[PDB]
Design a protein around this ligand. Structure first.
Ligand code: HEM
Ligand code: HEM
Ligand code: HEM
Ligand code: HEM
Lengths: 309, 309, 309, 309
């Protein structure tokens, strides 16, 4: 009966990520537009319903204490800035996240055009990226991106909250991280070295052998084993963006998870690293620019918001 | 026998316009990359040949006097800045124009990635727009854009130079104009007022009646009659762009023509206007930001450049 | 007025190559079916005309002296077996070549089913390959295959015979070579070594720098300069095939050209090699299995065959 | 008449590098042992004089301001820690450097045993490496190490100070850098990739062609041209060391030069890199652990030290 937000969707060829911060004293203006979002999605994306326009509304901690009364999600907190040994993961202020995805750029652009002008003057858009998609789902590093997202049962228990928090049954936690990795050192780097970085191959994306794969690789550090033996997986819709006029080539990481402890332990395996391997090899090239922790509610939660405190 | 550049191509769902100015003393570096462009196009766009990756290399006046010896195109000059009564059409310095077009954003992005890094350090990219495409070829104004481009004979004699300049048989002239029209006044404006602006309808794009269409409309001012009775047409691949994080909603106008006198008389009918109607009604909302006049050579001209002076 | 055979067609996702030798005393049986081929093509491929079923009938030297009277193509001869220093290019007997190409496998299969059973008992099919097509037009080596085929004027003068032989104005010469290259040594070989083999990159297929590209590379040896300065190009529809049950991974090379001297000089640059570089680096891995020289006539030539001698 | 320290010696099969820091208030204790060093060398190495035991005493900046009065070497300063884009060159505190070299390990060990116990309690040995020597002067990377050291006149003007500083006529400057490069990524890397790293071949150590050698290679970045056209060379006795019990495989770099500007420009060409090539390819695998800048005096300077301030 709790219908979740469309996070369990395939990767789309175009995507728009909006991190908009809410201005002071503009609470009821966003409280108007928050039930209107699914109406705008069904209004716009029904023009070409075979484009699969799907918005993912997400709300941070500050916007939760401002906008909503009653309960609170249990692990919803501001994104812990990870000041590691060499690489730092910053956290810019962002109240709400609009994650838009469809088959083409225009319908995402029009949904975002109608989104901020349903709450005109209430928000300033802090982060504006138009994430496109490479040839066979690659990123700017050249490796195929996101091939280990689960499906079915191993995905809905990976993302959707059950009754471990029954007031928010259904709903995820989001970690956006806008990277801006350089290509000057990455392109001069040889392929095999880059497979040491990633942990899988580049052309065919075969995972490397367990003894051949180094301990500080990305696919080596990001898989998390529990003590019972099961592995905890997240679903990430990482879409590359970039502007050649500034020479920017970045991959907008965005990870959906049942609890932010899993994503934060992955980020601890990357930035803080393992106690053997204290650095992740992709962070030698990728520097995070933005950061934020958010919460997806259900679409019923946007349909029936709790009253404004 | 002169093969022209692929200007006679249909409008593609994604486009990248690059206006890069050449740095001082970096002439031979661009002279290396200028024969390499068609090779890079055939190299990249053959991956998915049903995406129709097509670059249009264009060269301004300064880059012609720097890069090429021998002859000169007859009407190639810097873009005359039109300081009208109220609206001004500026002209930023830009040496060469890279016009890229294909079915998706990624292959245009990768061709542009390989374009500046075939001449690394020789250029600074002044203007960086990623032109996407609306639902049924619309622009951000809401009207269907570019429905009066000719086809066949009325297009090749509209764009390709014959032997009126036999040293450049085949080849066009380009007028880029990056507009940044506001949507706050345009959206509050009513539809029939906007059809007085355009001159055609909005939903179905029927051209209005000749008596009903006002004299200061866009479609009224831009059609040019000659004294023999024939009309001179240009081919324009106007692609909308925009950034909602700045609130920008612009249409990157780009017009290909056999001679820049035709495009300049259209711009005189818009900015300077008719002596009856001195203003074009779309310029009440559209303010030009950039501007430039360029020259398309043949692909044989890039294959066989004249020697560097 | 001479309509050529559909050789100037884009690469299709499926292809069937048939090298059938004609049995002794079965001349008039093939002489029946040879005007019927375009009728069968228009009959079958009109079911889904957006599959682009296109047959290329080709005739060798023996089938020309048997089947046709009157003139002879000037350079039509049996395929000269190249016994180089280490690699040998054999020539199995094959009278006629059926080159079939369309968007799917089934309509090529049905055209080939109707082709041999229009001349039932007259031929034995010596070589039977079902050439499929990789992701972005790649081959089994992993490199994008066939990205330097010309288009337009530089293709029709590359393939179609003018009036240098006016009795066969329009028409090409075909060099089939069924390779069976091993993947055990190629996969263990590193990427940059393979880019020394090919001469272009692997992921993005950028051609290498002229000083960086070695002299014994494939793209280095196969480009042919003339003494006037023009380069002679051929059009090749190389389609990969293979059978994993035998561990076969081969690329069916097939090259169309205006004269077989160009293709034979390319094969001399590969097998015999340059006098500096006597071996082509791809022939370290690719061993030719079959070989044949054929002639495409016009479709008018199949419509109006010369009388049977 | 100024006899220099034995820096102009061939590479020996065993070497001991000692970086010992002087304790506070133990100045006169080292001032006792500093004239005794050549006496200990002639005392121990005369047992088997065909082992060529040769110590190179070196003194840093802090030990110069503590131990010696009067003048100062002109460019003697603490080793500037190079915090590049990705690779950092640290500088641990080390007052004096004992560089020992002979045909076998034992006589170097005994000279070092008598060296610290001639100044017992005055020093703590910060860095203790026993540099052995590979098959044909190789290092752990597998390449032959140090084959471009000059000889004769081009070596004595490369190392020994003339009267550009006449108070220290004869004498060098030392840059020690204890690397700890990993072998897991280097061994999985292929040979030709490693020759792109080094710039010379691996088995026979032929220098590569000037166009074939990449710009970010080690031998490409470390050769320094002046504006007059002469090249500045240093002499380096790089000896490999290592401990397999920790999995350490390192090459103790130690470079002797007439002025530290040359060695520091080489380190700037490596870590900071060229403005085209900002990284040296061997620094992808080699991470510096220690670092220090020292000064070799003459042996007459140890025989006649200036009075203790
Ligand atoms: C710096 C930007 C990043 C890039 C370019 C990147 C790219 C990749 C690539 C290419 C793979 C291998 C293909 C696949 O399995 O997805 C991968 C794996 C993965 N990435 Fe990322 N990634 C980035 C950051 C992150 C972050 C910040 C997280 C989470 C905190 C993350 C989570 C994962 C996970 C969980 C895997 C799969 C591990 C396994 O297969 O179980 N990535 N990433
Ligand atoms: C300010 C940005 C502009 C916008 C949004 C715009 C949009 C449009 C639209 C919607 C139409 C009607 C549909 C069609 O016929 O194309 C049109 C017509 C046209 N536009 Fe534009 N346009 C712009 C600027 C220009 C400029 C700067 C030129 C040339 C100097 C130009 C040349 C034309 C021409 C020639 C026509 C067709 C007139 C006729 O049908 O013969 N436009 N434009
Ligand atoms: C052994 C099987 C072969 C394979 C796997 C193969 C594959 C390739 C590949 C990957 C390229 C680079 C991409 C492109 O430009 O096409 C290439 C180039 C080429 N191949 Fe082949 N090829 C083979 C045999 C041949 C043969 C037998 C000929 C002709 C006698 C030939 C003619 C060419 C030509 C003319 C080029 C382009 C050179 C230039 O760009 O001007 N190939 N081939
Ligand atoms: C990271 C550890 C290093 C290793 C394993 C290493 C090894 C090598 C090797 C194998 C060569 C080529 C053979 C020969 O010419 O010597 C070489 C060349 C050279 N190395 Fe190093 N090296 C290292 C660091 C350094 C450093 C830190 C410097 C000086 C700042 C340096 C200075 C040179 C010079 C000047 C050359 C010769 C360039 C030319 O031939 O003119 N090396 N090194």
């Amino acid at each position: 009966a709790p219908q979740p937000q469309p996070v369990l969707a395939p990767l789309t060829p175009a995507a728009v990520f909006l991190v908009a911060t809410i201005d002071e004293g503009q609470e009821a203006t966003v409280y108007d537009a928050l039930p209107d979002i699914s109406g705008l999605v069904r209004a716009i994306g029904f023009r070409d319903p075979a484009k699969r326009l799907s918005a993912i509304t997400s709300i941070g901690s500050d916007a939760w204490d401002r906008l909503f009364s009653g309960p609170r999600p249990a692990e919803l907190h501001p994104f812990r800035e990870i000041d590691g040994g060499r690489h730092h993961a910053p956290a810019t202020p962002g109240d709400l996240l609009f994650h838009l995805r469809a088959e083409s750029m225009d319908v995402c652009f029009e949904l975002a055009t109608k989104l901020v002008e349903a709450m005109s003057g209430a928000i300033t858009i802090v982060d504006e990226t138009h994430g496109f998609r490479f040839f066979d789902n690659r990123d700017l590093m050249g490796f195929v991106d996101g091939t280990e997202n689960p499906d079915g049962n191993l995905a809905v228990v990976a993302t959707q909250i059950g009754d471990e928090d029954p007031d928010f049954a259904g709903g995820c936690y989001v970690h956006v991280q806008k990277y801006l990795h350089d290509m000057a050192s990455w392109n001069s780097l040889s392929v095999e070295e880059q497979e040491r970085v990633i942990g899988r191959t580049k052309l065919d994306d075969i995972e490397l052998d367990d003894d051949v794969k180094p301990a500080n690789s990305h696919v080596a550090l990001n898989v998390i084993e529990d003590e019972d033996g099961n592995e905890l997986k997240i679903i990430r819709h990482n879409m590359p963006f970039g502007e050649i006029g500034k020479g920017e080539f970045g991959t907008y990481y965005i990870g959906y998870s049942r609890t932010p402890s899993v994503t934060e332990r992955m980020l601890d395996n990357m930035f803080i690293g393992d106690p053997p391997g204290n650095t992740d090899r992709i962070l030698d090239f990728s520097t995070a620019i933005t950061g934020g922790l958010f919460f997806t509610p259900t679409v019923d939660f946007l349909d029936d918001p709790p009253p404004l405190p």
